[PDB]
């Protein structure tokens, strides 16, 4: 996260850190708890991941230093990538992780509400991007979860900022015209959380941008509301 500040423990209890154990253990991506055996994240996170056996999901983490060999994690039973996904820049950058065991909800770990089809029309004014990613292009993963409040940008405005890309309505952009606050390397897969009528909603999934926090280069997020039926298809399968 660029231009952010340290989060407080329990502030973003749906935020997870997804680690890979291959070749050595390291933070891979962010993610969000959306159900008691479900993590919503970005499809591009699994580039080169041949098995869910190398994945570890850590919930209830403020600081990466809380993670040692003896720290409890959730194993991943299955990786579900959207069928139409090719690359982050073309959209469909969405994936589900089916956990091997269920998450026990509490004040440290709980789900974020998915947006409603009725909320497709609402204007969100209190949106925050969170993660342990870099604070600039050449940096390192941050120990403490960071947060940055960023305004949503219309599709029309985001399309003029990304000449040469096709910014679809399945994408949602966020950033200040002057830049300064954004997601960066290591934040992808994590949430763009917006508070509406005192309820937090998972509006976006951190996907891509041209550099980090650059002027007139909004961060591009998977527009979660456009995938509610897809998530329900996968999580509510008979």
């Amino acid at each position: 996260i660029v231009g952010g500040t340290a989060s407080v423990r329990g502030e973003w209890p749906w935020q997870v850190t997804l680690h890979t154990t291959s070749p050595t253990q390291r933070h891979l991506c962010g993610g969000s708890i959306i159900g008691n055996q479900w993590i919503l994240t970005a499809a591009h996170c699994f580039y080169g991941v041949e098995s869910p056996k190398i994945l570890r999901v850590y919930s209830g983490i403020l600081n990466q230093s809380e993670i040692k060999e003896d720290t409890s994690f959730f194993g991943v039973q299955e990786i579900i990538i959207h069928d139409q996904y090719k690359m982050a820049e073309s959209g469909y950058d969405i994936a589900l992780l089916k956990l091997e065991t269920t998450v026990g909800y509490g004040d440290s770990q709980r789900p974020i509400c998915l947006p409603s089809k009725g909320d497709r029309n609402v204007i969100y004014t209190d949106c925050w991007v969170t993660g342990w990613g870099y604070r600039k292009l050449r940096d390192k993963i941050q120990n403490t979860l960071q947060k940055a409040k960023i305004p949503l940008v219309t599709n029309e405005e985001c399309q003029k900022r990304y000449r040469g890309h096709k910014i679809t309505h399945k994408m949602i952009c966020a950033g200040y015209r002057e830049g300064g606050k954004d997601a960066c390397k290591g934040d992808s897969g994590g949430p763009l959380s917006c508070k509406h009528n005192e309820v937090w909603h998972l509006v976006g999934i951190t996907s891509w941008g041209e550099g980090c926090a650059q002027r007139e280069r909004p961060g591009v997020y998977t527009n979660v509301v456009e995938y509610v039926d897809w998530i329900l298809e996968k999580t509510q399968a008979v």
Binding site: G35, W38, P115, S116, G118, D119, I231
Partner: peptide, 5 residues
């Protein structure tokens, strides 16, 4: 939530 998992 309105949407239930």
């Amino acid at each position: 939530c309105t949407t239930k998992i």
